[PDB]
Design an enzyme around this catalytic site. Sequence first.
Site, PDB file in Angstrom:
ATOM      1  N   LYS D  33       0.795  -1.221   0.000  1.00  0.00           N
ATOM      2  CA  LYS D  33       0.000   0.000   0.000  1.00  0.00           C
ATOM      3  C   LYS D  33       0.833   1.280   0.000  1.00  0.00           C
ATOM      4  O   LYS D  33       0.318   2.355  -0.284  1.00  0.00           O
ATOM      5  CB  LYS D  33      -0.972  -0.001   1.180  1.00  0.00           C
ATOM      6  CG  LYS D  33      -2.244  -0.784   0.920  1.00  0.00           C
ATOM      7  CD  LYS D  33      -2.740  -1.470   2.177  1.00  0.00           C
ATOM      8  CE  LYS D  33      -3.438  -2.776   1.846  1.00  0.00           C
ATOM      9  NZ  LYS D  33      -4.626  -3.000   2.710  1.00  0.00           N
ATOM     10  N   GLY D  47      -8.928   3.289  -0.118  1.00  0.00           N
ATOM     11  CA  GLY D  47     -10.018   3.359  -1.076  1.00  0.00           C
ATOM     12  C   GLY D  47      -9.809   2.426  -2.255  1.00  0.00           C
ATOM     13  O   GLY D  47      -9.202   1.368  -2.115  1.00  0.00           O
ATOM     14  N   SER D 129     -10.404   1.858   6.108  1.00  0.00           N
ATOM     15  CA  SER D 129     -11.522   1.286   6.843  1.00  0.00           C
ATOM     16  C   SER D 129     -11.268   1.269   8.344  1.00  0.00           C
ATOM     17  O   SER D 129     -12.194   1.413   9.134  1.00  0.00           O
ATOM     18  CB  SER D 129     -11.801  -0.133   6.343  1.00  0.00           C
ATOM     19  OG  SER D 129     -13.175  -0.452   6.451  1.00  0.00           O
ATOM     20  N   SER D 169      -8.943  -4.936   7.511  1.00  0.00           N
ATOM     21  CA  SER D 169      -7.500  -4.833   7.684  1.00  0.00           C
ATOM     22  C   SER D 169      -6.948  -6.141   8.226  1.00  0.00           C
ATOM     23  O   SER D 169      -7.650  -6.882   8.906  1.00  0.00           O
ATOM     24  CB  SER D 169      -7.155  -3.693   8.640  1.00  0.00           C
ATOM     25  OG  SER D 169      -7.396  -2.437   8.043  1.00  0.00           O
TER      26      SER D 169
END
Lengths: 235, 239, 231, 220, 204, 232, 236, 228, 202
Positions: D33, D47, D129, D169
């Site tokens: 990420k 997102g 999230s 996650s």
Amino acid sequence: GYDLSASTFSPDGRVFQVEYAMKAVENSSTAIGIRCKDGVVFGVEKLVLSKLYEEGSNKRLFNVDRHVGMAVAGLLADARSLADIAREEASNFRSNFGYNIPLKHLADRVAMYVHAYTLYSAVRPFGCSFMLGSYSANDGAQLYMIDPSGVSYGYWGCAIGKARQAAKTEIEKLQMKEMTCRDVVKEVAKIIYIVHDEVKDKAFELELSWVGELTKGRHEIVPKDIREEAEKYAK
Amino acid sequence: SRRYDSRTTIFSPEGRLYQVEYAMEAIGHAGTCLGILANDGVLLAAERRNIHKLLDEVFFSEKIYKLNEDMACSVAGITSDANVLTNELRLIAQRYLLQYQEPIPCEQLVTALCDIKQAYTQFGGKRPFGVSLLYIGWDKHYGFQLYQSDPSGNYGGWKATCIGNNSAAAVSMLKQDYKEGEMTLKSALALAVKVLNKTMLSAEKVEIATLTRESGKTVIRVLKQKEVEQLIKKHEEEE
Amino acid sequence: DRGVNTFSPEGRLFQVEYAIEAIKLGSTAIGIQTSEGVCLAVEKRITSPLMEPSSIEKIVEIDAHIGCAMSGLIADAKTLIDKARVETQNHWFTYNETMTVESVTQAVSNLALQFGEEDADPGAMSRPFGVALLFGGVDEKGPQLFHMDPSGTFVQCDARAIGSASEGAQSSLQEVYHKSMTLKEAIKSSLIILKQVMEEKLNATNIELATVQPGQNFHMFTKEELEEVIK
Amino acid sequence: TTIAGVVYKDGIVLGADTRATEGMVVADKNCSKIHFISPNIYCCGAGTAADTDMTTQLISSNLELHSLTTGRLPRVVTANRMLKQMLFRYQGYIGAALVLGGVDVTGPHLYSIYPHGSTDKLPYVTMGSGSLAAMAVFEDKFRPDMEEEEAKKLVSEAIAAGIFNDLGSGSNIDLCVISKSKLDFLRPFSVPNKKGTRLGRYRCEKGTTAVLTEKVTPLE
Amino acid sequence: SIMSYNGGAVMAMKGKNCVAIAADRRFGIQAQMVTTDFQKIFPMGDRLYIGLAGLATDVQTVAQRLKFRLNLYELKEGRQIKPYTLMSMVANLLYEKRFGPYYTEPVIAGLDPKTFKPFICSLDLIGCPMVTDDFVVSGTCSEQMYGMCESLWEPNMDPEHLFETISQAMLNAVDRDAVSGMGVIVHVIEKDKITTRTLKARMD
Amino acid sequence: SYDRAITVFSPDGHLFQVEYAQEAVKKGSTAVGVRGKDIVVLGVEKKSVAKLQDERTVRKICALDDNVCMAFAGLTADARIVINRARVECQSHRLTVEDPVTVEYITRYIASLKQRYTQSNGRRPFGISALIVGFDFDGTPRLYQTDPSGTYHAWKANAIGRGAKSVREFLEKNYTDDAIETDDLTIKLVIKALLEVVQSGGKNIELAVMRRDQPLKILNPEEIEKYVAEIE
Amino acid sequence: GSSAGFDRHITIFSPEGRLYQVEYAFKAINQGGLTSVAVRGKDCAVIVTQKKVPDKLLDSSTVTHLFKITESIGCVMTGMTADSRSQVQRARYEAANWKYKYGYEIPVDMLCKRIADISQVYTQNAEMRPLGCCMILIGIDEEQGPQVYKCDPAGYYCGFKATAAGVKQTESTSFLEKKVKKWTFEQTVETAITCLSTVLSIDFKPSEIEVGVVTVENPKFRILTEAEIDAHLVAL
Amino acid sequence: GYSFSLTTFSPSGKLVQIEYALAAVAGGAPSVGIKAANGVVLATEKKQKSILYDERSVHKVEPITKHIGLVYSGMGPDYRVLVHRARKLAQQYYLVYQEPIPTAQLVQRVASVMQEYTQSGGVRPFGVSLLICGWNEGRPYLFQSDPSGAYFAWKATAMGKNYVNGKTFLEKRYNEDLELEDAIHTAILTLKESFEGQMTEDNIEVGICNEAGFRRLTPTEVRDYLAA
Amino acid sequence: TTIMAVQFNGGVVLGADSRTTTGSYIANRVTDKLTPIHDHIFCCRSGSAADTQAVADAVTYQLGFHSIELNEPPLVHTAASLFKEMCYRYREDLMAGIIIAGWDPQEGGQVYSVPMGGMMVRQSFAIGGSGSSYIYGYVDATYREGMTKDECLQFTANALALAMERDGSSGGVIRLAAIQESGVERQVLLGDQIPKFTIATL
């Protein structure tokens, strides 16, 4: 053939097509502008080339804005188109920023638009010079002059046309800085009469315009009374 | 604008297009490109012009280009112009394959590029492409084929043809040496070596590509240094 | 060298002037307007005997009440003729009535000076049409004969001749013409004049003839009809 | 997804989880990420994955062009400007919530860019999230001008909070320490989750699968 | 759902020095089967294959457009495309239709042209690449494929062992799915050979 | 875009570009056409008779549709462009209207295009002349001829190219109603006209024929050698 | 050299490979009759220029060759007046656009490059002629100090320690060469004023020249007043 | 702008404009490219000869990407356009394939842009010959793109002024198995065969290309190489 | 969001909250809603964070370019006119209520309110944002003409504090600003500095 296009420099670094457009401004009648202590006075020696024309036809003085005046010399067809362009800039400016366009910015905008016609062969340079004058309570009195190349400077006294070199001398004598619009009207009227050729040219009409503190910052033609009062003093 | 215009796409007093004619003179000085069609294949033999000790090899070929799976070509004239045309040829073949899901026939590919060259001699006010091409390939309609186009958009199918520098002497030597219908790849290669030697020869001065069929699959390959060298020696034995 | 929109020292556009010189090379067309109707005639100028005389069409029907005879560059005329046809069909669709002869001519006269290189798109004329037209129809003002040329200037005439021998034909029209002629008399005089300014022996397949009377529609004389008028 | 970043004493510490989910099923167990923008600037993404990847690929390619032209070290404001001007022009259609952080001539800068085009310049940010869980850790343990090791500990704790509390996650914890003299990309920096060992062997023996047709094609 | 309109499922597994790619053969509109031999896996090189699951029309369209670009790419710079480079090319192609994309989730499986290192990946409809070191699935029965793959896959599997694992995985996964099945085709890519076999599957 | 006027008028009312385009047609190969009772013949003189050339790729007689075929003279590259446009127009006419196009309809369309290139900016005129031949729905043999200017005419027998003046003259005093009595005399007529201009007459004369309700047929080396011997 | 076609009329290569039109644009820079000089110090940048104002009717407060591009960048134009204003207008737009897009102020060397890039397009396109003006930019760099850049009509630009443009350009560079071969704010301003003075031999007065400066302590570009210019003029 | 071509074919079949653009490159500053096994080296004469000019202000040797460098001979202003296009062409390639563009691919894309100016309307050909170097897949690359759009692969080549005498000398010193360090000495030696005065650290610019990427040597580095 | 601007003799006084929320979650609790357009021209922002940031950026780019060409300090009314133009032109998309406030030599300290629709009205003081509804009656009963620079700072802080305590979308710290002929005086009122008001107890 270095002078056939405006997008061509000559061997000695000159743009002949732009110099030829300034030659057309020298054939026009002389127009002068004088900025006094509280305004600007315009005076053109309108040459009447026919008796069939109506008194006031082919006027060389326009109203680009309520506070701005414009004296022209050269091609009337070209000058009229430049007057429309100046009216648009001033109109657009008010819509965008919400207030009257400063004279210096108007001169800049129009001069840059005039300079754009002296770069390519797709068009031709304008063949007319013009002076812009306006009065503001905070800005004061301003008088600019734009020539065919696009150069525009601020002036105190200015003249363009046939006898602009002889009309300039008779303008330096006057002390416009400490003078007033009402008194300058006659001065300008007298200057135009002295330089007017009566041996080569025919008859002419006197076009007078002014903007300043007396007209409340609004540009308008000099009233008949004053116009005739200055016409007799200059005769 | 109307004074600087050289008017490249207009007729002349005698009814000839000057720009096209001048562009064909540029192809007459370029490296020799020859094509010979056999019964079991077709070959291309171009004389290398990029000859220098400091010149790197890098690419797999300098004058021969692979258009698609079953087609290869040889350019002549302005090399930079040939780069635009070869890229357009590959795009034309890929477009045809995306529409019909099948390889494009040799003649349809040559015709599409000849229509583009014809358009530059009629309108647009631009100079034509100063490049002559030689196409070799195999299709399921006419088997092995050998085509040749020019700057004007003209094109024709041949059995054996040569373009570029000294293409007139090669053509005349090909007519008296070619056997209509009875030509084999091996014998075709020998003829190519005898034509390049006459219009000139080392193995670095030439480039040879052959196009044959193997198990229902087209195979294009450039002959190796040694592969060509032997050919050159065998022609010296007959001389 | 110069542009296509270049004015000459006199005050005339070169291109237009050059296009008027191309109208003096085509075959002669004659138009005559009477109270009974308008009659159009034109020589076919057959070059070779192997060519089919009917393939040559110098007189076309613009509408039921409007005919048209041309001269000069025949290929240029086709572009104008189609515009005239569509113009009259548009008028009918919009106003449910026929278009006048003057209106049609004016609409076709607007394309005359619509040419030029710079400041124009791909579908624009590069030069002017090298052809003169003779419109003859019948509307509310009775028979009418208008004449249009390459400069886009159209007028009205009782008897007009266009083409290589228009100069000579004009004189004969002025001599043998009055404002009380009949349609049959107009036709006869038309053939006579056309027969004097020709090289080939005017027969029934050498010329073309068409009339537009107030009653019937635009009609093109047949071989037999033309042969019986030659007597 | 849980991404976070803090501004310590002399640099920027970025961190994120490595799990990628497609719906309510784990698609990728070891996803990256933290994206590279430039040598001194990195970006964390939340997102839409396809949007974040394409958006960061473009901005980094534009900054590389800009860095070649000027011949100077790129600034975080430049990257911030390019991203916010692009995201605002797509009216939030390019769902790309990023945590931009780097170090230039004006020091370390931390930015949080939202999909619509709004950006914030804070000392510590969280996104994804599980951003609320990471924020809770930052709201109770963040101190101004922390040491490199302390910032790495706080960021790890923040990412871990989202990993064990948010269902979106999981997996490992990747970190990225950026300073004026270095850039340590720690992937992974922590592996707090381990898959249980198989209790049996279901190795498919040769010949267990019935074959109808078979073809062999040799290669070169 | 638009993605389950035609059905289908593709799989890719990594072995020791090889890769395997499998797919269902059923082609059908909703609950009606049309054919039982619809191609889902396409060769993008000697040792590079790509599986496509989703809308049947988009499967053929994306497969045909990918070949168009791949062909031009190989002609331009005379060399076989690398597995990772093909994934970028596909992602780019898929992300081009960001707002109104193709309804297919590709799966790439192959070996590098100079080192023969196994490579497998899967992208989403908008082109989001995801490289893994074990297996990748795509289709209507992705949940069933994950379950089978997670418990059967073993590291460093030989070609023979790898084939059996991917066969059992797909076989048992498509049997629990209604719109997927009608036969299974498997491609085992090695360094010197490509073995292709069809499996004995249920036809209901 | 290039928008310069290429074709303009001259002092004596002449379109130089169109006249230069017609000069190119005279340097082209000779192509004669004869309209018979129930047959249409199109003969062309193969200037280049190279033995290493594939004859199927350099043919001058094409087909626009099932009932219309044509030959040309002049720039070969221009002809192809025109032929391809005419082919597309034929299919367009079969779409909108539910019937085949007439010979004059497609001749009018080809002539319309040619004229457009003589009055458009940034483009030169086509340097070719076409000899459209075919049959209509009623079974009538048509023979039209277009030129660079854009003017078309229906003929009975016409020749275009280098030796068109001679062929035409010869055709004028040879084409009668008895000279085209059958499907063999018409073929012998086309070959006769071509033989008085074509160097080494015989193997340098390609010729196709078209009979009512029948595709297009191109006589080969043997078929044409029997007609060339018959004459003698 | 030689000539072929329309090489002397438009920007196309000649037989020797030269662009005559671009050479004629350099000759148009000396048609204004003025001369500007720029000197770089250690903590500042100095711009001085001839301020000719013949007629007294023409307002002298509007006759300036010194223009403000941004808050930290200033410049002096030399050559065709109309062309100069056009170029200055573009520079202001280019600088404002840069700040808007990148979020930080455009470096002096980048602005010069951008302006030079635009001038190179006129040398390649034949439909339009090159500008007959010259630009000299001065400013303080974030991590480089005072800068002095100059870009001509050929599209070529560069960085300088001291540069001059106009009729008196050769002599000005010959005098500046010696000055740099052998500098505080005062020393730099005096050096620039001296160069212009000795090259023209006219002993400039307070309202005869215009001076523009930028310092490290005061990066903001400003134009010295007559009194301020007279204070430096009575110290030489 | 004009829509017609400025470069057309002459009676002999030559494109004079392109040939006149090659004369501009021949009168330019000498450039040297040498490929020596473990890398490539680009060297160019950068004599400003005026003293006020800031040597570090501009650059002749520019990086197109992380592994590709560029050098030129001819017009400087034209070179800046090509350098900007090459940088854009390289970034575009990386946005699609997510991998550094191969040196050969970039040279073809840049040559395509140069060919466009010899056929488009209202424009003249670029008056600059390029010398591109790169390192992809453990291999040194050296290309040369001229004004006409043609490009060749070289082992060692000279550019600009006195290039005819630069090639002969370069061919008499070039060796197949030459290391980068030794190639950096022959590149400076061939540049010193027409340097008139004395070659200094800021009088000539050198760029080397190896497996670590492309980088422009510095004054310090050049000084050390110039002493030896 | 709660923004407020009041004018006095010298210039104006701007103030706002710092809460940026998304539903019931505070994304940013120390947001700076007072953006500088020019040296003496500021603007409070309310509504959409991305809309107002893009509009403020555009105006800032235009006003600075306009100020350089005119070679003069921009008027406050011109900045209001540029905001008004953008907010009216794109009134369907943008969701911004801008308060423009500043000082210029021609008109002194002026406050212009540019609400959601895109109209433009000059006021002696203005309030915007969602939290402004709770303080309409207080600014009506508390504001008097002839307030000094220091009195405007207290009056603004008192109003913002009252709104922050009642509005769920307002909170954080208070950021004040004083614009004069001199320059800008920025200042933050943290936790205990925030004016307090007792809660009615029983």
